[PDB]
Enzyme design. Structure first.
Site, PDB file in Angstrom:
ATOM      1  N   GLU A 177       0.877  -1.161   0.000  1.00 46.00           N
ATOM      2  CA  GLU A 177       0.000   0.000   0.000  1.00 46.00           C
ATOM      3  C   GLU A 177       0.921   1.218   0.000  1.00 46.00           C
ATOM      4  OE1 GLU A 177      -2.169   0.595   3.658  1.00 46.00           O
ATOM      5  OE2 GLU A 177      -3.908   1.377   2.583  1.00 46.00           O
TER       6      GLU A 177
ATOM      7  N   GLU B 143      -8.232  10.716   2.544  1.00 41.71           N
ATOM      8  CA  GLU B 143      -8.391   9.764   3.626  1.00 41.71           C
ATOM      9  C   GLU B 143      -8.688  10.543   4.897  1.00 41.71           C
ATOM     10  OE1 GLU B 143      -5.417   6.677   3.889  1.00 41.71           O
ATOM     11  OE2 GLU B 143      -6.050   6.085   5.908  1.00 41.71           O
TER      12      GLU B 143
END
Length: 189
Positions: free
Chosen positions: A85, A176
């Protein structure tokens, strides 16, 4: 708001995920545009881009990003084999995601120095199920909410440092948030 999930909108892949806490809405707009509005959210990630990404994409983003609390604005994505990620963080709120992380170098790109870090997620959700995997970070020193990201400069610097990427999965400009509030309106191309 739209239903959490992935799909295509106006020529762009999108992903919108949240933890079910409430307090966040995500909308897809014209072209590469998306908006996020949140108030005492849980954890969420949303944005637009590509599925799959590439290792030499130049990603443009433009707009407004106004977090109140913990949030990031990044080029964000995954690779497989190895499972990674990754984040090229252009702006953030109250928390620098590299806090306490091992610094793995610096790279200069698109008008700023970035600091490079590696972290590890242990038995956490991922695109292939629960797993232990590394995260790679480039964190921009000079924060901004518009710009261009030459992803190759990051991926090449990471590789130089021993931070290998596998086959690309999705690659988006993402907002996010983690238990925070804010608003954002971002256009990708």
């Amino acid at each position: 708001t739209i239903q959490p999930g992935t799909g295509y909108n106006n020529g762009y892949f999108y992903s919108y995920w949240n933890d079910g806490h409430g307090g966040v809405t995500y909308t897809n707009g014209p072209g590469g545009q998306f908006s996020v509005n949140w108030s005492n959210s849980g954890h969420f990630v949303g944005g637009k881009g590509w599925q799959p990404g590439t290792k030499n994409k130049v990603i443009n983003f433009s707009g407004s990003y106004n977090p109140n609390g913990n949030s990031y604005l990044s080029v964000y994505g995954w690779s497989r084999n190895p499972l990674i990620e990754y984040y090229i963080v252009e702006n953030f709120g109250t928390y620098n995601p590299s806090t306490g992380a091992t610094k793995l170098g610096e790279v200069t790109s698109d008008g700023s120095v970035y600091d490079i870090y590696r972290t590890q997620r242990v038995n956490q959700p991922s695109i292939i199920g629960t797993a232990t995997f590394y995260q790679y970070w480039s964190v921009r020193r000079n924060h901004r909410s518009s710009g261009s990201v030459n992803t190759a400069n990051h991926f090449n610097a990471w590789a130089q440092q021993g931070l290998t990427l596998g086959t690309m999965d999705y690659q988006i400009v993402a907002v996010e948030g983690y238990f925070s509030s804010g608003s954002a309106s971002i256009t990708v191309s």
